[PDB]
Design a protein around this motif. Structure first.
Motif, PDB file in Angstrom:
ATOM      1  N   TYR A 278     -12.568  -8.695 -23.623  1.00 30.11           N
ATOM      2  CA  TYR A 278     -11.745  -7.920 -22.709  1.00 30.11           C
ATOM      3  C   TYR A 278     -10.623  -7.235 -23.470  1.00 30.11           C
ATOM      4  O   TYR A 278     -10.016  -7.822 -24.370  1.00 30.11           O
ATOM      5  CB  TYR A 278     -11.164  -8.790 -21.577  1.00 30.11           C
ATOM      6  N   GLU A 279     -10.376  -5.977 -23.118  1.00 33.09           N
ATOM      7  CA  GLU A 279      -9.135  -5.310 -23.480  1.00 33.09           C
ATOM      8  C   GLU A 279      -8.043  -5.565 -22.452  1.00 33.09           C
ATOM      9  O   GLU A 279      -6.858  -5.381 -22.756  1.00 33.09           O
ATOM     10  CB  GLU A 279      -9.380  -3.802 -23.638  1.00 33.09           C
ATOM     11  N   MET A 280      -8.421  -6.010 -21.259  1.00 29.60           N
ATOM     12  CA  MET A 280      -7.481  -6.353 -20.203  1.00 29.60           C
ATOM     13  C   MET A 280      -8.135  -7.361 -19.264  1.00 29.60           C
ATOM     14  O   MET A 280      -9.258  -7.148 -18.806  1.00 29.60           O
ATOM     15  CB  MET A 280      -7.050  -5.102 -19.436  1.00 29.60           C
ATOM     16  N   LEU A 281      -7.445  -8.466 -18.987  1.00 30.24           N
ATOM     17  CA  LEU A 281      -7.969  -9.513 -18.115  1.00 30.24           C
ATOM     18  C   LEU A 281      -6.902  -9.889 -17.096  1.00 30.24           C
ATOM     19  O   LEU A 281      -5.851 -10.427 -17.461  1.00 30.24           O
ATOM     20  CB  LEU A 281      -8.405 -10.743 -18.914  1.00 30.24           C
ATOM     21  N   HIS A 282      -7.172  -9.609 -15.824  1.00 30.14           N
ATOM     22  CA  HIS A 282      -6.338 -10.072 -14.725  1.00 30.14           C
ATOM     23  C   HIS A 282      -6.999 -11.292 -14.098  1.00 30.14           C
ATOM     24  O   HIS A 282      -8.146 -11.217 -13.642  1.00 30.14           O
ATOM     25  CB  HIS A 282      -6.131  -8.978 -13.680  1.00 30.14           C
ATOM     26  N   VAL A 283      -6.282 -12.410 -14.074  1.00 29.19           N
ATOM     27  CA  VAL A 283      -6.821 -13.686 -13.621  1.00 29.19           C
ATOM     28  C   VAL A 283      -6.258 -13.986 -12.240  1.00 29.19           C
ATOM     29  O   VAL A 283      -5.036 -14.021 -12.052  1.00 29.19           O
ATOM     30  CB  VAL A 283      -6.493 -14.820 -14.603  1.00 29.19           C
ATOM     31  N   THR A 284      -7.148 -14.198 -11.272  1.00 31.64           N
ATOM     32  CA  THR A 284      -6.747 -14.747  -9.987  1.00 31.64           C
ATOM     33  C   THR A 284      -6.960 -16.250 -10.035  1.00 31.64           C
ATOM     34  O   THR A 284      -8.113 -16.699 -10.120  1.00 31.64           O
ATOM     35  CB  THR A 284      -7.547 -14.128  -8.845  1.00 31.64           C
ATOM     36  N   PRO A 285      -5.901 -17.061  -9.982  1.00 28.79           N
ATOM     37  CA  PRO A 285      -6.063 -18.484 -10.261  1.00 28.79           C
ATOM     38  C   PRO A 285      -6.819 -19.178  -9.145  1.00 28.79           C
ATOM     39  O   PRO A 285      -6.811 -18.718  -7.990  1.00 28.79           O
ATOM     40  CB  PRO A 285      -4.613 -18.992 -10.348  1.00 28.79           C
ATOM     41  N   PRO A 286      -7.503 -20.282  -9.442  1.00 26.85           N
ATOM     42  CA  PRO A 286      -7.992 -21.148  -8.367  1.00 26.85           C
ATOM     43  C   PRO A 286      -6.821 -21.679  -7.558  1.00 26.85           C
ATOM     44  O   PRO A 286      -5.728 -21.902  -8.080  1.00 26.85           O
ATOM     45  CB  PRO A 286      -8.717 -22.273  -9.115  1.00 26.85           C
ATOM     46  N   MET A 287      -7.052 -21.868  -6.265  1.00 22.56           N
ATOM     47  CA  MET A 287      -5.980 -22.316  -5.387  1.00 22.56           C
ATOM     48  C   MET A 287      -6.419 -23.473  -4.494  1.00 22.56           C
ATOM     49  O   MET A 287      -7.608 -23.660  -4.234  1.00 22.56           O
ATOM     50  CB  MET A 287      -5.461 -21.143  -4.552  1.00 22.56           C
ATOM     51  N   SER A 288      -5.445 -24.250  -4.034  1.00 19.99           N
ATOM     52  CA  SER A 288      -5.713 -25.501  -3.338  1.00 19.99           C
ATOM     53  C   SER A 288      -4.520 -25.810  -2.446  1.00 19.99           C
ATOM     54  O   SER A 288      -3.456 -25.189  -2.582  1.00 19.99           O
ATOM     55  CB  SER A 288      -5.964 -26.645  -4.336  1.00 19.99           C
ATOM     56  N   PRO A 289      -4.662 -26.750  -1.514  1.00 19.39           N
ATOM     57  CA  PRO A 289      -3.496 -27.205  -0.766  1.00 19.39           C
ATOM     58  C   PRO A 289      -2.490 -27.850  -1.696  1.00 19.39           C
ATOM     59  O   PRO A 289      -2.858 -28.395  -2.754  1.00 19.39           O
ATOM     60  CB  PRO A 289      -4.083 -28.224   0.222  1.00 19.39           C
ATOM     61  N   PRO A 290      -1.203 -27.798  -1.355  1.00 20.50           N
ATOM     62  CA  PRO A 290      -0.192 -28.446  -2.201  1.00 20.50           C
ATOM     63  C   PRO A 290      -0.492 -29.927  -2.382  1.00 20.50           C
ATOM     64  O   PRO A 290      -0.986 -30.596  -1.471  1.00 20.50           O
ATOM     65  CB  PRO A 290       1.113 -28.219  -1.431  1.00 20.50           C
ATOM     66  N   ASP A 291      -0.188 -30.432  -3.582  1.00 19.08           N
ATOM     67  CA  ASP A 291      -0.581 -31.791  -3.950  1.00 19.08           C
ATOM     68  C   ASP A 291      -0.033 -32.822  -2.970  1.00 19.08           C
ATOM     69  O   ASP A 291      -0.716 -33.801  -2.643  1.00 19.08           O
ATOM     70  CB  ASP A 291      -0.107 -32.106  -5.370  1.00 19.08           C
ATOM     71  N   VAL A 292       1.195 -32.618  -2.487  1.00 17.88           N
ATOM     72  CA  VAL A 292       1.807 -33.576  -1.573  1.00 17.88           C
ATOM     73  C   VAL A 292       1.071 -33.636  -0.238  1.00 17.88           C
ATOM     74  O   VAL A 292       1.211 -34.618   0.500  1.00 17.88           O
ATOM     75  CB  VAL A 292       3.296 -33.233  -1.374  1.00 17.88           C
TER      76      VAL A 292
END
Ligand SMILES: Cc1cc2nc3c(=O)[nH]c(=O)nc-3n(C[C@H](O)[C@H](O)[C@H](O)COP(=O)(O)OP(=O)(O)OC[C@H]3O[C@@H](n4cnc5c(N)ncnc54)[C@H](O)[C@@H]3O)c2cc1C
Ligand SMILES: [Cl-]
Length: 413
Positions: free
Chosen positions: A249-263
């Motif tokens: 890649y010359e450019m990589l935009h990452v959409t992170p994995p997401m989850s409910p808050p740990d608490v």
């Protein structure tokens, strides 16, 4: 043990809005917000920040300046939820009890689920519009793009604003045409989903764009590894398990994995997946009647957007008022939500829909077209509406606006 009639967990969009509304019902001295962060952000701005159209400073204000006057800011983190005894634990070793509880802890980012992030962000050519630490790195990577692949990802988890991962792609592709580098760019959207969008009307429109501008979209393709120093990314083929691909890649935009808050994950208020277990129509908790939820942290079967939070705040305001009079809630939340799909530096496809994934457009014209007006609304008007209307409890969605707009379209027909 300190007690509050209404205790709000989280000082984000839903927390500040609910605290403003509850202040009118019970008094400012009977409301408290539990929020650790000293800054409060209007996150929808970060899409344009990563595109270079807006500054990051304009998207944030001190948390102190959005706390409703008279309401106590409990500056700390929630560490435990004990609803069977109407109490809360706090990373200051403090216990707080409540008569009513409003949970608005948002969604949690987990870049660490991708190897090796977030350490890869220390290198150039990689950014992410979803974190205040990385949104400006998206813009730096877009400016310094010379030639190669511009890759944009969508994880295999629930997300907040599902349109944002492709908004920056359309903006990056427009920037390459603007600056004479489109002939050098190979724009790739690798998404874990099998469709570009969840609503047929707007997905068809977004598909016209993808064909017209020669964008490559690989469905059921998920990012699993980043070799940042090598400027390589590893994607897994969800369609043919076991198949992986290393791509430069010359450019990589990452959409992170997401989850409910740990608490919340193993909390007694969660469902089997960790989200706050709330009624689909009233937002009241399905187990504990004095617990309520709003926003990304809930299991409300609709898009996790700030527009949905606005519509949910009006419903939840009525729900708690009716419960405070011992009556039964009658007004049902329709699952309204909206994703302002930026397709260029001055166009927006304004998608609005409900629980049935059917269009619920506010304006008379066809919002599936790219519109300068809807761009001017999102960029130059929504921020004012957010800070001054919604955070003060004066915005519950555009339902009244949609009805009066359709009344005039009956006056003309
Ligand atoms: C790049 C991007 C673009 C977006 N664009 C749009 C758009 O155009 N339109 C739209 O409608 N939506 C958009 N969204 C979505 C919108 O930003 C969110 O959906 C919205 O903020 C949800 O509000 P919330 O209160 O549920 O979560 P948040 O506003 O994120 O609030 C969560 C809060 O909880 C706090 N918190 C977390 N853990 C704890 C804890 N343990 N104890 C106490 N407090 C805690 C956090 O500090 C935070 O203040 C976008 C999102 C992103 C990331
Ligand atoms: Cl309202």
């Amino acid at each position: 043990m300190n007690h509050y009639e209404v205790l709000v967990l989280g000082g984000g969009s839903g927390g500040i809005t609910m605290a403003a509304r509850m202040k009118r019902k019970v008094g400012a001295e009977n409301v408290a917000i539990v929020e650790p962060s000293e800054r409060h952000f209007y996150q929808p701005i970060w899409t344009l920040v990563g595109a270079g159209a807006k500054q990051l400073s304009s998207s944030g204000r001190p948390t102190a300046s959005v706390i409703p006057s008279g309401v106590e800011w409990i500056k700390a983190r929630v560490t435990e939820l004990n609803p069977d005894k109407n109490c809360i634990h706090t990373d200051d070793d403090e216990k707080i009890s409540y008569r009513y509880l409003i949970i608005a802890l948002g969604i949690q980012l987990d870049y660490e689920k991708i190897k090796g992030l977030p350490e890869g962000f220390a290198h150039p050519k990689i950014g992410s519009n979803y974190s205040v630490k990385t949104v400006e790195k998206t813009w730096k990577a877009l400016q310094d793009f010379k030639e190669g692949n511009a890759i944009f990802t969508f994880p295999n988890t629930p997300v907040k604003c599902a349109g944002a991962p492709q908004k920056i792609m359309y903006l990056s592709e427009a920037y390459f045409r603007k600056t004479g580098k489109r002939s050098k760019a190979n724009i790739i959207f690798n998404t874990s989903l099998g469709a570009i969008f969840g609503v047929k009307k707007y997905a068809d429109a977004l598909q016209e764009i993808i064909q017209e501008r020669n964008l490559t979209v690989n469905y059921k393709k998920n990012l699993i590894e980043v070799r940042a120093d090598k400027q390589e990314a590893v994607f897994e083929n969800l369609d043919k398990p076991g198949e992986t691909q290393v791509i430069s890649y010359e450019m990589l935009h990452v959409t992170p994995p997401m989850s409910p808050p740990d608490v919340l994950k193993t909390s007694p208020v969660a469902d089997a997946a960790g989200w706050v277990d709330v009624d689909k129509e009233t937002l009241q908790h399905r187990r504990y009647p004095n617990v309520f939820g709003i926003g990304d942290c809930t299991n409300l079967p609709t898009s996790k957007t700030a527009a949905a939070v606005a519509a949910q705040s009006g419903i939840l305001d009525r729900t708690i008022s009716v419960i405070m009079k011992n009556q039964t809630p009658t007004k049902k939340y329709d699952g309204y939500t909206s994703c302002p799909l930026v397709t260029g530096y001055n166009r927006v496809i304004l998608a609005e829909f409900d629980y049935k994934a059917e269009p619920l457009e506010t304006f008379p014209f066809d919002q599936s077209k790219e519109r300068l007006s809807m761009y001017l609304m999102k960029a130059d008007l929504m921020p004012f509406l957010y800070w001054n209307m919604m955070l003060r409890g004066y915005w519950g969605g555009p339902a009244f606006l949609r009805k009066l707009f359709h009344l005039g379209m009956s006056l003309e027909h």
